[PDB]
């Protein structure tokens, strides 16, 4: 397990449109389940992440991802 | 999102046959129908449907449609028993019908009649058959080994299944991949590769070229591939898949189906077109003239088409086969099975060792949401809404 990203480092929140497939399957099904203000561990399987390709140079193939997500605001 | 209805159908499906049905609808009703074939419509329809703008009607495999249901309208049918009961089951999600089934698209064994007058009825024949054909200067059998859709029919032949079905439900916890039947199936496929009867690297593209060229005696494919064998001036026929250990090869079968978008206001107009124009011996024929659908859900025209050994063979492979479940966890099945097979062929893992992995990988939830801090519990994100989050991401 190694850290590949953090918004809290950059100190700018991250905004995505739900259902537009801007993000991985695990984030669309996953954050849709969070209430506003909730913080949760998203344990995403490779199927719902980058699967057998992975993300070139950053995430290997068949990599299960863990995300610490806090849903701050809806817009 | 207009007063006329727009239809989306794949480029291999013969949209011009469908167009002539739409033009007949126009002569009778006045409504203009335009049929499109977008490059990646399967992935595109969900992105646009979430905005509330997409086509009125979409034609795909029933399997993708299960995900659309978790963005698609219930159809109301009453005296629509013109279609087979098993085709209706394909388009049913939580006891609700999602679409109108059209075609049964089962894999078959296709074979060059000039290279092989009588195809082998068993898998065990093919090694011996390949030596006889290899001496002549050609192969026995080439098909996609990369995608598990094509390898599975052999694997599940002596037992073994994606997800066990009991009490009218699928059990996402009970996977049938690390059982004996699966292992026997897979090990025979690996052995064919180990004995240079098939090559791990061969894919759909590679296999298609060889059979159309006439370098290979037999391929494995659906009726989507028929128009290209037709053009290639190769005397071919379609038969039952060879049995493994006396059991038939059981391919997963996709049904071409017609769903309606919830954001289509033309639902009443769309329903009439499907019920009373498309699902008609003449309607379906107009399509089949352009590109064959194989076996069709309508009994009327299926009783006609099954006079052709191809369409009769397609239905046979569909009966001995099982219909493809539309439940979400099938994503994680196909992923688990594709990696297991590819690595068995690679010799990375043993067969017993890859299927062990597959049994775990198939049953794993796509995403698990465990709470760290609780939320308000009322407000949930809705499709077309921007989510503002902080996140930390790391590998597990
Ligand atoms: C600097 O940091 C990068 C993101 C990094 C890349 C590497 C990964 C380890 C990671 O560190 O994010 C990461 O932690 C991760 O895995 N993420 C980010 C958080 C959401 C979940 C996941 C992800 O889906 O990233 C995404 C993943 C990597 C790729 C996508 C996966 C889903 C798939 O459907 C997409 O199809 C294309 C591709 C990247 C994103 O979240 C960004 C926002 C989205 C895209 C780039 C595409 O949707 C793009 O397609 C044209 C768009 O439509 C966007 C809106 C257009 C605008 C101008 C682009 C904004 C780009 C922002 C880029 C950012 C902040």
Q: Residue B103: which H helix or E strand, with range? A: strand B99-105
B46 touches chain A (CB under 8 A): yes
Q: Which of B89, B78, B52, B75 is nearest to B274 (CA)?
A: B75
In a domain, A39, yes or no: yes
In this structure, are residues B224 and B108 in contact, taking their beta carbons and an 8 Å threshold? no
Q: End-to-end distance of chain A based on CA atoms, in angstroms? A: 33
CA distances from B372 to A38, A39, A68, B87, B369 (A): 8, 5, 8, 45, 10
CB within 8 Å of A25: residues ≥ 6 apart? A47, A48, A49, B331, B366, B367
In a domain, A42, yes or no: yes
Give the separation between CA B86 and CA B175, rounded to whole angstroms: 23
CB within 8 Å of B357: residues ≥ 6 apart? B336, B339, B340, B343, B349
B338 touches chain A (CB under 8 A): yes
In a domain, A41, yes or no: yes
Q: Residue A71: which H helix or E strand, with range? A: strand A65-74
Q: How distant is the Cα of A53 from the closest Cα of chain B, in angstroms?
A: 11
Q: Which of B34, B362, B300 is nearest to B171 (CA)?
A: B362
Retrieve residue B109's tokens: 């064994």
Pairing of strands B236-239, B96-97: unpaired
Could you count the other beta carbons within 10 Å of the beta carbon of residue A6? 14
CA distances from B173 to B157, B170, B180, B352, B378 (A): 22, 9, 18, 20, 30
In a domain, A57, yes or no: yes
Q: How distant is the Cα of B341 from the closest Cα of chain A, in angstroms?
A: 13
Q: Which of B396, B205, B340 is nearest to A68 (CA)?
A: B396
Give the separation between CA B108 and CA A68, rounded to whole angstroms: 47
Q: Looking at beta carbons, which pairs linking B351-358 to residues 24 or more positions away fall under 8 Å?
A: B351/B183, B351/B186, B351/B187, B351/B190, B352/B183, B354/B186, B355/B177, B355/B178, B355/B182, B355/B183, B355/B186, B356/B178, B358/B175, B358/B177, B358/B178
The three-class DSSP label of residue A61 is: coil
Q: Which of B73, B65, B2, B72 is nearest to B32 (CA)?
A: B2
> Looking up tokens 């397990």, which residue turns up?
A1
Alpha carbons within 13 angstroms on the beta-carbon side of residue B24 total 17
Residues of B in contact with A55 (CB under 8 A): none
Retrieve residue A43's tokens: 């344990």
Q: Which of B328, B387, B46 is nearest to A31 (CA)?
A: B387
In a domain, A15, yes or no: yes
Burial pattern B356-371, b for ≥16 Cβ within 10 A else e, equals bbbbebbbbbbbbbee
Q: How distant is the Cα of B44 from the closest Cα of chain A, in angstroms?
A: 9
Number of A to B CB contacts under 8 A, please give it: 190
In this structure, are residues B189 and B351 in contact, taking their beta carbons and an 8 Å threshold? no
Give the separation between CA B77 and CA A4, rounded to whole angstroms: 52
For chain B, helix (H) and strand (E) counts, in that order, are: 15, 16
Specify the ligand 1 atom closest to the Cα of A23: 24
Our mutation pick for probing the ligand 1 site, out of A2, A17, A24, A63, counting the most ligand atoms within 8 A of Cβ, is A24
Retrieve residue B334's tokens: 């196909």
Residue nearest to atom 25 of ligand 1 (CA): A23
In this structure, are residues B159 and B182 in contact, taking their beta carbons and an 8 Å threshold? yes
Give the separation between CA A25 and CA A36, rounded to whole angstroms: 20
H/E/C letters for each residue in B24-66? Answer: HHHHHHCCCEEEECCCCHHHHHHHHHCCCCCCCEEEEEHHHHH
In a domain, A53, yes or no: yes
Q: Which of B240, B393, B42 is nearest to A63 (CA)?
A: B393
Alpha carbons within 13 angstroms on the beta-carbon side of residue B381 total 30
Residue nearest to atom 57 of ligand 1 (CA): A22
In a domain, A2, yes or no: no
Give the separation between CA B169 and CA B148, rounded to whole angstroms: 24
CB within 8 Å of B105: residues ≥ 6 apart? B61, B222, B223, B224, B253, B254, B255, B256, B293, B294, B314
Q: Residue B99: which H helix or E strand, with range? A: strand B99-105
Could you count the other beta carbons within 10 Å of the beta carbon of residue B136? 9
User: Which residues form the domain of A12?
Assistant: 7-71
Q: What is the CATH number of the domain that holds A48?
A: 3.10.50.40
Q: What is the CA radius of gyration of chain B?
A: 23
Residues of B in contact with A38 (CB under 8 A): 371, 373-376
> How many folded domains does chain A comprise?
1
Contact criterion met (CB < 8 Å) for A67 and B393: yes
Q: Which residues lie across from B259 on neighbouring strands?
A: B58, B99
Q: Which residues lie across from B165 on neighbouring strands?
A: B170
Q: Residue B191: which H helix or E strand, with range? A: helix B180-194
């Amino acid at each position: 397990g190694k850290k590949f990203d953090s918004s809290r480092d950059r100190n700018k929140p991250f905004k995505f449109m739900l259902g537009k497939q801007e993000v991985i399957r695990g984030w669309e099904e996953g954050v849709a389940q969070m209430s506003v203000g909730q913080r949760a561990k998203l344990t995403i399987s490779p199927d719902y992440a980058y699967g057998a390709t992975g993300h070139p140079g950053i995430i290997p193939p068949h990599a299960t991802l863990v995300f610490d997500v806090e849903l701050l605001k809806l817009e | 999102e207009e007063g006329k209805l727009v239809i989306w159908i794949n480029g291999d499906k013969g949209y011009n046959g469908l167009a002539e049905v739409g033009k007949k609808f126009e002569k009778d009703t006045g409504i203009k129908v335009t049929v499109e074939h977008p490059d990646k419509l399967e992935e595109k329809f969900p992105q646009v449907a979430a905005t509330g703008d997409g086509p009125d009607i979409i034609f795909w495999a029933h399997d993708r449609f299960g995900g659309y249901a978790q963005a698609e309208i219930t159809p109301a049918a009453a005296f629509q028993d013109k279609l087979y009961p098993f085709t209706w089951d394909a388009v049913r999600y939580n006891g609700k019908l999602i679409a109108y089934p059209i075609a049964v698209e089962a894999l078959s064994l296709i074979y060059n009649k000039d290279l092989l007058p009588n195809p082998p009825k068993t898998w065990e024949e093919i090694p011996a058959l390949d030596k006889e054909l290899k001496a002549k200067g050609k192969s026995a059998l080439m098909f996609n080994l990369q995608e598990p859709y094509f390898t599975w029919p052999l694997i599940a032949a002596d037992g073994g299944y994606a997800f066990k079905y009991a009490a009218g439900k699928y059990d996402i916890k009970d996977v049938g991949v690390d059982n004996a039947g699966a292992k026997a199936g897979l090990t025979f496929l690996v052995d064919l590769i180990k004995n240079k009867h098939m090559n791990a690297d061969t894919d759909y593209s590679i296999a298609e070229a060889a059979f159309n060229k006439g370098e290979t005696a037999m391929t494995i494919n659906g009726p989507w591939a028929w128009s290209n064998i037709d053009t290639s001036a190769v005397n071919y026929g379609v038969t039952v898949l060879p049995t493994f250990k006396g059991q038939p090869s059981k391919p997963f079968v996709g049904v071409l189906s017609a769903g309606i978008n919830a954001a289509s206001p033309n639902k009443e107009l769309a329903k009439e077109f499907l019920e009373n124009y498309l699902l008609t011996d003449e309607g379906l024929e107009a399509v089949n003239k352009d590109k064959p659908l194989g076996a069709v859900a309508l009994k009327s025209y299926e009783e006609e088409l099954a006079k052709d050994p191809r369409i009769a063979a397609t239905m046979e492979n569909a009966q001995k086969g099982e219909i493809m479940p539309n439940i979400p966890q099938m994503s994680a099945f196909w992923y688990a099975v594709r990696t297991a097979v590819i690595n068995a062929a690679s010799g990375r893992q043993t067969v017993d060792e890859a299927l062990k992995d597959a049994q775990t990988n198939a049953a794993a939830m796509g995403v698990q949401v465990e709470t760290i801090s609780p939320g308000d519990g009322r407000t949930f994100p809705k499709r077309g809404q921007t989510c503002v989050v902080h996140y930390t991401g790391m590998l597990e």
